[PDB]
Amino acid sequence: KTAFSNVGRKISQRVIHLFDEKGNDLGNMHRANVIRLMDERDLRLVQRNTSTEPAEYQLMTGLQILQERQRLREMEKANPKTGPTLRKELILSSNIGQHDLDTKTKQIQQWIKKKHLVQITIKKGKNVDVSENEMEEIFHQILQTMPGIATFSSRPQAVQGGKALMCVLRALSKNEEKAYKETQETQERDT
RNA sequence: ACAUUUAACUAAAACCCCUACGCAUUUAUAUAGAGGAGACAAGUCGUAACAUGGUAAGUGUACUGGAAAGUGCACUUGGACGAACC
Ligand SMILES: [K+]
Numbered sequence: 001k002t003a004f005s006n007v008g009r010k011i012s013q014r015v016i017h018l019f020d021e022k023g024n025d026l027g028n029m030h031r032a033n034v035i036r037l038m039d040e041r042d043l044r045l046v047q048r049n050t051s052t053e054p055a056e057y058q059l060m061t062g063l064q065i066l067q068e069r070q071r072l073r074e075m076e077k078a079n080p081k082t083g084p085t086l087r088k089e090l091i092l093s094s095n096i097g098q099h100d101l102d103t104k105t106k107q108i109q110q111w112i113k114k115k116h117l118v119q120i121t122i123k124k125g126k127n128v129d130v131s132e133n134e135m136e137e138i139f140h141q142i143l144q145t146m147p148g149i150a151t152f153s154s155r156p157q158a159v160q161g162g163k164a165l166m167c168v169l170r171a172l173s174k175n176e177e178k179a180y181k182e183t184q185e186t187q188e189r190d191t
Numbered sequence: 192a193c194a195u196u197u198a199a200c201u202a203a204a205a206c207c208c209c210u211a212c213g214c215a216u217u218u219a220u221a222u223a224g225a226g227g228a229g230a231c232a233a234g235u236c237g238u239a240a241c242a243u244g245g246u247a248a249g250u251g252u253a254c255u256g257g258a259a260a261g262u263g264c265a266c267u268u269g270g271a272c273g274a275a276c277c
């Protein structure tokens with residue numbers, strides 16, 4: 001998270017690949033020599049590209065610093081590209097009551113609808129002996145509620161020496177969805 | 192609605208009416224189904240309250256929510272502010 005604003009008269013790095021206001025390449029110069037050009041022409045330096053290993057800074061007028069981001073306010077509006085996926089966690093118990101399993105199963109439907117990743121963990125119930133035969137039958141019971149909407153990303157594993165099982169769910173991908181749709185129509189309509 | 196008759200040298204005889212009660216009305220019971228409260232006391236999801244209970248608590252009202260509840264507006268102390276200046 002950054003902004004196209006002036007860095008000020010405090011430069012962290014001694015050597016900077018300075019750039020002219022008109023786009024001319026001044027070339028690498030000492031940090032002290034950079035401030036001389038900020039006063040000589042009353043201009044502000046903005047870091048154009050952090051990624052490059054050599055420091056890159058371009059000095060431009062205040063109006064030039066407004067027009068730049070004023071276009072970054074439209075590019076994201078016109079073509080927003082927000083793809084981060086939040087990860088959610090749930091820790092259930094083998095002996096979880098059905099009512100609590102229907103309330104937590106409806107919470108997963110809101111997460112899958114918002115394209116989140118649901119990490120589900122199941123633990124041995126309090127003073128209850130149970131294997132992984134019926135302890136792994138809750139995932140299939142939760143996924144069934146979401147037939148097309150959700151599908152496994154990861155699969156049940158013995159995270160902690162078999163006492164607990166962890167799985168990850170995701171929203172069905174567009175392509176996958178179409179495949180599911182296509183299959184559903186043939187079973188009933190063709191018959 | 193209904194009618195004064197016979198009799199009368201001692202005096203008597205004669206008499207006999209029609210309409211109500213209902214698909215009205217009152218109260219209670221039985222039954223399909225639905226939903227409270229209590230007792231008992233498991234399990235499950237949380238941790239709302241009691242300490243400034245970890246966002247002080249609560250009243251009224253409104254909206255909201257798996258659930259205790261949360262928020263807004265006004266009100267209360269059945270809260271506190273540490274009690275010379277510095
Ligand atoms: K409270």
Ligand SMILES: [Mg+2]
Binds near residue numbers: 239244
């Ligand atoms: Mg509490």
Ligand SMILES: [Mg+2]
């Ligand atoms: Mg509290």
Ligand SMILES: [Mg+2]
């Ligand atoms: Mg209140």
Ligand SMILES: [Mg+2]
Binds near residue numbers: 255
């Ligand atoms: Mg709210």
